[PDB]
Amino acid sequence: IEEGKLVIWINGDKGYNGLAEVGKKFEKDTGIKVTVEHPDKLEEKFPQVAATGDGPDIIFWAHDRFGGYAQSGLLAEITPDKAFQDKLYPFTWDAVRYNGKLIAYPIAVEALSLIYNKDLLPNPPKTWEEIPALDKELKAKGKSALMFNLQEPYFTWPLIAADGGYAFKYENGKYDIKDVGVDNAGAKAGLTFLVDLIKNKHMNADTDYSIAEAAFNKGETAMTINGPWAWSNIDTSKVNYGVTVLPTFKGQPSKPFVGVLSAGINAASPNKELAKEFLENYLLTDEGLEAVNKDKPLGAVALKSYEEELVKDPRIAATMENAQKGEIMPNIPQMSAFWYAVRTAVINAASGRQTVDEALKDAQTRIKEALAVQKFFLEEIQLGEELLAQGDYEKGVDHLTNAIAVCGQPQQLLQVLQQTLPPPVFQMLLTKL
């Protein structure tokens, strides 16, 4: 990473040009060029590159990814004093606190809403159960009721959670990672409803973000499900839209997972002070947030002074009504496993590769299996290393062999062990493999 410049990654659905405007203000005032990039799959690319000391100085994503980044040592602990922390809502700081340390700056609170075309649909449905018949009526006029991104489970989650699906059970401030709610009766009921819509040709399994956005913005579908960022392109399209509460399912509110868009500093950045100056003094100001927001709306921002303005917008009132019916995501490392497993279940059930029951059963099994193996691997390395530091060689090596046994490609692990273990002990270990 280059000293004396800032490189920023943010997702391509957000106001990256507006963020670049903040970057030009920063460059005007300071030495310092700010390059804003929006790589594809940045939330996967970041841990790959930052593990080698490469990547952006600053990473923007929802807070759910950040505990895993911090666990891997990829993020700098951030350094705001009390006066600065008091400028943002306390719950936003909670979202970026991990093992007692703040690991990112909160920017804005994101929740999905139902977005509808008021000319096609002056009174939108209050329930999921109403959607099939509405679709049939719209299909007779060459329209459809609903299109949204089925390829990312973020957009189907509110329906899965409605009647009781959950990721990891909340226990008095902590998440219980042994208590997974992906294959429960409520999760199965909501996904079954979505998959029946598809079976009966009221929705297409292949619909993705850009298909749905184009359909809505061209006046072809009466409804979509999307976040605040999407409102700019609908403005440009001139569709007469409303933003409202998500439909209920079996009388229960849909429960979106709420994201706090957050900015982390790469642990390998040589520009940590410049990143702090940019984030605290340029971005997290009314003017900085306004520049980004004008490009693509942020949602409900973390910065009190600017949020006090935005709450007057009826679209933000709707976003907050949906947020309050949902739950703030965990930031724990296990979120990555959850999302990969549920993504697979949704796609497989929607496509007919699996039944809903089998898809979610398998997702639950995959999450719990991944977490059990990780737990065992880490515990056995620790225990083996601890026993070696005490001179019980035989028992120490036996535990290290158990960890290696549950690692399919142990070359990197063996390189790490070769750096810490005395050579005679590493040699002993090699003979057990």
Binding site: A51, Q71, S72, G73, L74, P333, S336, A337, Y340, A370, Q374, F377, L378, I381, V406, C407, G408, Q409, P410, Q412, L413, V416
Partner: peptide
């Protein structure tokens, strides 16, 4: 951090 970087969803 060093041991956590050896793991992914896909495996080790």
């Amino acid at each position: 951090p060093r041991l956590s970087r050896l793991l992914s969803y896909a495996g080790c």
